[PDB]
């Protein structure tokens, strides 16, 4: 709510969680690309889509529960119930992409980009690669064939199972 909460949240997070937060909030800011997490939070507050519940949900997606226990004075049960009842902000596709990118180590992404180089043109992370793929209109919540096939080819079948489960859910 107040600027104190935003300042504390900015001070608490590190670089990796900041990048994950930017990726998660990429869709809600449909036309604005923010350079800092501070700018993103200011934009969300100005647009009126930021509240105590929404900020708690965003911090819960990043998996920082001590921040909920300290700043927002909330536990995981309350935010879980709020998700169950109140519709959430980030789509299931974004959190699925984050979950997939969490499991890929620092070496498999190089093999994946080498495989995918034929469709496009240097320490790329999986999140940056999927952002590029979405930019080239190759990966969409309706088009998940390329990612599933490429994950199968590099012999990572648990992630293929995750993608299949997500497709079955919707």
């Amino acid at each position: 709510m107040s600027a104190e909460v935003i300042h504390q949240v900015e001070e608490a997070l590190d670089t990796d969680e900041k990048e994950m937060l930017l990726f998660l909030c990429r869709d809600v800011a449909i036309d604005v690309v923010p350079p800092n997490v501070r700018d993103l939070l200011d934009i969300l507050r100005e647009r009126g889509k930021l509240s105590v519940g929404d900020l708690a949900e965003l911090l819960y997606r990043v998996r920082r529960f001590d921040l909920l226990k300290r700043i927002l004075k909330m536990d995981r049960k309350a935010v879980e119930t709020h998700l169950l009842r109140n519709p959430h902000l980030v789509s299931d596709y974004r959190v699925l992409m984050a979950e997939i990118g969490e499991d890929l180590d620092k070496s498999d992404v190089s093999s994946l980009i080498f495989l995918m180089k034929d469709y496009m043109g240097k320490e790329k992370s999986f999140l940056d690669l999927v952002v590029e793929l979405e930019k080239l209109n190759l990966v969409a919540p309706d088009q998940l064939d390329l990612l599933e096939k490429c994950l199968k080819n590099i012999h990572r079948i648990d992630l293929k199972t995750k993608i299949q489960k997500y497709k079955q859910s919707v």
Binding site: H155, R156, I157, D158, T161
Partner: protein
């Protein structure tokens, strides 16, 4: 975390030789590049999990590996499975996930002594360079090297029979049994 604890308990008992035997037996599902940095049972279990061949619901492959390397105490202690049930399950077609080729190769390797190993090496000092014929190499590495030079395949067994005929007859009996099963 009962499943992970069970896997850790199973992997605690394995020694270096059993680890090498498992690594040889799991060649069709793990490439050489992933095989090189493997140094203990936990890494191998992680690799098997990554291919979804080993999880909470599915434990057939781990039981088959334990049965092949002749470790039944672990099966009866940490997995609650006996020998007869495992044999009956394996005899059912389509259940075995390891081809008979690897099984017979490992069984042949289990029945070679140091003198017989030296005889095997001397019989094959012509088609293979001395680099892979050092005294430290065991029979499994020799088999892998021969597989690398397409002189020992699933349908090609002339060299193996010719070398085994100069050492013992029981090895030829095992080869004949495998051919009969084919």
């Amino acid at each position: 975390m009962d499943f992970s604890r069970n896997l850790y308990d199973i992997g605690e008992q394995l020694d270096s030789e059993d680890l090498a035997s498992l690594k040889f037996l799991s060649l069709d599902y793990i490439p050489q590049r992933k095989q090189e940095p493997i140094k203990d049972a936990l890494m191998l279990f992680q690799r098997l999990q990554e291919k979804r061949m080993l999880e909470e619901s599915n434990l057939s492959f781990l039981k088959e590996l334990l049965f092949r390397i002749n470790r039944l105490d672990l099966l009866i202690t940490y997995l609650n499975t006996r020998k007869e049930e495992m044999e009956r399950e394996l005899q059912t077609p389509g259940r075995a996930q390891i081809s008979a080729y690897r099984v017979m190769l490992y069984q042949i390797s289990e029945e070679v002594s140091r003198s017989e190993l030296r005889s095997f090496k001397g019989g094959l000092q012509e088609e293979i360079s001395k680099c892979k014929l050092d005294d430290d190499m065991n029979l499994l590495d020799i088999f892998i090297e021969m597989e690398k030079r397409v002189i020992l395949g699933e349908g090609k067994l002339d060299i193996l029979k010719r070398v085994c005929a100069q050492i013992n007859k029981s090895l030829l009996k095992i080869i004949n049994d495998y051919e009969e099963f084919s």
